[PDB]
């Protein structure tokens, strides 16, 4: 059933499992018209489907087309959403498919158990749990490659950098819902701690810098001070 | 008019046929049901007294032979039985009416009710859904499963109702799944209506039996059913405008037979409230949303 506080250390076991998060398929800013009405602009999308155990990142990019002349575009965000993973999984080697794909949205339930009949073994599941994928557009290079697209396009990225030589998926997971939480409470702040240090860069090839692992104490500390910060801030504390 | 003589009464039942029903007491000399009208199905039903666990009974259509009940004591139950010696059975009730021991299918002369109910209700479409093809005459109580009930055990005793299911590659065409499963017409009108039952007055029958074996006996699988059907053509987008005014006349004579007392087992609060104020048919069920709202607007 759904992913909850009891049965979490299952993201980490061999059995395949993706995480599907649709929070940035469908992105619009909302305007005036010379009217005075309010009208959205549709910019390009993503979806976030993320093996938590090995951080392999199917980026599948949303191109604004794909809404062109289409009505009820929230609701047709979820369908192609779950079309879209669909058409992963079916692009996929038999070994390599997953066993399980837990939506972070339950909205995401019924497209996705649709699309995917023909594979009555892969288990569709929700999550209490509260994910922060919705911040992966806070990452530099995912934003980059989202806005330059011209055409759909897939993107495959590993979103642990080469951490797991060093840590296990446990503690990658959670350095990386860390780094995102802290985006999303207060992406000004994060990014200035992630990048304070000039002497610590971002290798071409990876999205995140090159942190000692001394140094990604002090960071994952202040990540934490910044969330509690804010906290305290939003409620007064 | 025809009869349904019985042996004898040896044990104290509620005795239902249709939707009228009357106390027998142990060992009372009740001889059977005379005057049941000729031309529609009819379903005589039981509820013991000592042990209201399973109502159960018999459909059956007095054209397809002579019928009569007698008490196994057994088997612990009344059972239909068929006599296929006509003048036996002849004599037999002329002498129960002469000693007037029958009670009288009692028929108001306007009332339409149970025509209402089984319009669409066919004896030859009763034997396929239940499978005992020995007898003209059809047995179903208050514990028998339906065929997708047993996918989710004993096959024949089952009630084998058209299997209906929206997330299911029969539901759903490779390609629309978005189109399909928000817009059931594909569903209804091609796989269900021209494919399964060929027209509408089979659909219309099965809905009907499902119903009646659901407020009779209590079947949950037949109530189920009753609201799956009722949901798929609410779900359409594209229906016939005569299969949408015939299932307002349909559903509105359901509600307004079934006892005040058994909707909040008999009535499912999501499949109402969809059908009659989210559904593409919201706006064509003008009778059935009068007496929902003026009879059970708690549900809603
Ligand atoms: C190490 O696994 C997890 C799983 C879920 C989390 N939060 O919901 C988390 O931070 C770590």
């Given at each position: 059933g759904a992913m909850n506080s009891s049965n979490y250390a299952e993201l980490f076991?061999?059995?395949?499992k993706?995480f599907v998060d649709?929070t940035?398929?469908?992105?619009?800013?909302?305007?005036?018209?010379?009217?005075?009405?309010?009208?959205?602009?549709?910019?390009?999308?993503?979806?976030?489907?993320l093996?938590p155990?090995?951080?392999?990142?199917?980026?599948?990019?949303?191109?604004?087309?794909?809404?062109?002349?289409?009505?009820?575009?929230?609701?047709?965000?979820?369908?192609?959403?779950?079309?879209?993973?669909?058409?992963?999984?079916?692009?996929?080697?038999?070994?390599?498919?997953?066993?399980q794909i837990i939506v972070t949205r339950k909205?995401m339930?019924?497209?996705?158990?649709?699309?995917?009949?023909?594979?009555?073994?892969?288990?569709?599941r929700p999550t209490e749990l509260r994910l922060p994928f919705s911040?992966?557009?806070?990452?530099?290079?995912?934003?980059?490659?989202?806005?330059?697209?011209?055409?759909?396009?897939?993107?495959?990225?590993?979103?642990?950098?080469?951490?797991?030589?060093?840590?296990?998926?446990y503690?990658?997971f959670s350095?990386l819902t860390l780094?995102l939480r802290?985006?999303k409470?207060?992406?000004?702040?994060?990014?200035?701690?992630?990048?304070?240090?000039?002497?610590?860069?971002?290798?071409?090839?990876?999205?995140?810098?090159?942190?000692?692992?001394?140094?990604?104490?002090?960071?994952?500390?202040?990540?934490?001070?910044?969330?509690?910060?804010?906290?305290?801030?939003?409620?007064?504390? | 008019?025809?009869?349904?003589?019985?042996?004898?009464?040896?044990?104290?039942?509620?005795?239902?046929?249709?939707?009228?029903?009357?106390?027998?007491?142990?060992?009372?000399?009740?001889?059977?049901?005379?005057?049941?009208?000729?031309?529609?199905?009819?379903?005589?039903?039981?509820?013991?007294?000592?042990?209201?666990?399973?109502?159960?009974?018999?459909?059956?259509?007095?054209?397809?032979?002579?019928?009569?009940?007698?008490?196994?004591?057994?088997?612990?139950?009344?059972?239909?039985?068929?006599?296929?010696?006509?003048?036996?059975?002849?004599?037999?009730?002329?002498?129960?009416?002469?000693?007037?021991?029958?009670?009288?299918?009692?028929?108001?002369?306007?009332?339409?009710?149970?025509?209402?109910?089984?319009?669409?209700?066919?004896?030859?479409?009763?034997?396929?859904?239940?499978?005992?093809?020995?007898?003209?005459?059809?047995?179903?109580?208050?514990?028998?499963?339906?065929?997708?009930?047993?996918?989710?055990?004993?096959?024949?005793?089952?009630?084998?109702?058209?299997?209906?299911?929206?997330?299911?590659?029969?539901?759903?065409?490779?390609?629309?799944?978005?189109?399909?499963?928000?817009?059931?017409?594909?569903?209804?009108?091609?796989?269900?209506?021209?494919?399964?039952?060929?027209?509408?007055?089979?659909?219309?029958?099965?809905?009907?039996?499902?119903?009646?074996?659901?407020?009779?006996?209590?079947?949950?699988?037949?109530?189920?059913?009753?609201?799956?059907?009722?949901?798929?053509?609410?779900?359409?987008?594209?229906?016939?405008?005569?299969?949408?005014?015939?299932?307002?006349?349909?559903?509105?004579?359901?509600?307004?037979?079934?006892?005040?007392?058994?909707?909040?087992?008999?009535?499912?609060?999501?499949?109402?409230?969809?059908?009659?104020?989210?559904?593409?048919?919201?706006?064509?069920?003008?009778?059935?949303?009068?007496?929902?709202?003026?009879?059970?607007?708690?549900?809603?």
């Amino acid at each position: 059933g759904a992913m909850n506080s009891s049965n979490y250390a299952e993201l980490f076991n061999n059995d395949i499992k993706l995480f599907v998060d649709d929070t940035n398929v469908y992105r619009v800013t909302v305007h005036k018209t010379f009217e005075g009405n309010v009208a959205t602009k549709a910019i390009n999308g993503c979806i976030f489907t993320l093996n938590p155990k090995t951080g392999h990142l199917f980026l599948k990019i949303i191109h604004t087309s794909v809404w062109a002349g289409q009505k009820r575009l929230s609701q047709l965000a979820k369908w192609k959403t779950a079309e879209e993973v669909s058409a992963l999984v079916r692009s996929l080697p038999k070994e390599e498919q997953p066993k399980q794909i837990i939506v972070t949205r339950k909205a995401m339930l019924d497209p996705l158990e649709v699309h995917m009949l023909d594979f009555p073994n892969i288990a569709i599941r929700p999550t209490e749990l509260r994910l922060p994928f919705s911040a992966a557009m806070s990452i530099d290079k995912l934003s980059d490659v989202v806005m330059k697209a011209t055409e759909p396009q897939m993107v495959l990225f590993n979103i642990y950098d080469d951490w797991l030589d060093r840590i296990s998926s446990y503690t990658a997971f959670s350095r990386l819902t860390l780094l995102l939480r802290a985006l999303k409470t207060n992406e000004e702040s994060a990014k200035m701690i992630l990048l304070s240090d000039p002497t610590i860069t971002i290798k071409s090839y990876h999205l995140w810098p090159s942190f000692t692992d001394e140094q990604w104490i002090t960071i994952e500390s202040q990540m934490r001070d910044l969330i509690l910060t804010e906290y305290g801030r939003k409620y007064n504390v | 008019m025809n009869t349904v003589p019985f042996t004898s009464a040896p044990i104290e039942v509620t005795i239902g046929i249709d939707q009228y029903s009357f106390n027998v007491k142990e060992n009372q000399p009740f001889h059977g049901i005379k005057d049941i009208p000729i031309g529609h199905v009819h379903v005589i039903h039981f509820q013991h007294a000592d042990n209201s666990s399973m109502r159960y009974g018999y459909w059956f259509d007095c054209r397809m032979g002579n019928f009569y009940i007698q008490y196994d004591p057994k088997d612990g139950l009344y059972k239909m039985m068929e006599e296929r010696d006509g003048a036996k059975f002849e004599n037999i009730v002329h002498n129960f009416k002469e000693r007037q021991m029958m009670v009288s299918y009692p028929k108001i002369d306007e009332d339409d009710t149970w025509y209402n109910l089984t319009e669409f209700v066919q004896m030859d479409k009763i034997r396929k859904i239940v499978r005992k093809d020995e007898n003209q005459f059809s047995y179903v109580d208050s514990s028998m499963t339906t065929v997708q009930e047993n996918e989710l055990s004993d096959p024949a005793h089952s009630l084998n109702y058209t299997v209906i299911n929206f997330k299911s590659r029969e539901a759903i065409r490779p390609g629309h799944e978005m189109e399909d499963f928000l817009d059931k017409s594909y569903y209804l009108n091609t796989v269900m209506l021209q494919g399964i039952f060929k027209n509408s007055s089979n659909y219309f029958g099965e809905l009907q039996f499902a119903f009646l074996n659901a407020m009779f006996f209590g079947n949950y699988g037949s109530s189920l059913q009753w609201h799956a059907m009722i949901e798929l053509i609410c779900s359409s987008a594209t229906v016939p405008k005569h299969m949408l005014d015939k299932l307002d006349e349909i559903l509105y004579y359901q509600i307004k037979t079934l006892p005040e007392q058994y909707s909040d087992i008999l009535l499912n609060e999501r499949v109402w409230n969809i059908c009659l104020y989210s559904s593409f048919q919201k706006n064509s069920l003008h009778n059935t949303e009068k007496i929902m709202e003026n009879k059970y607007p708690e549900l809603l």
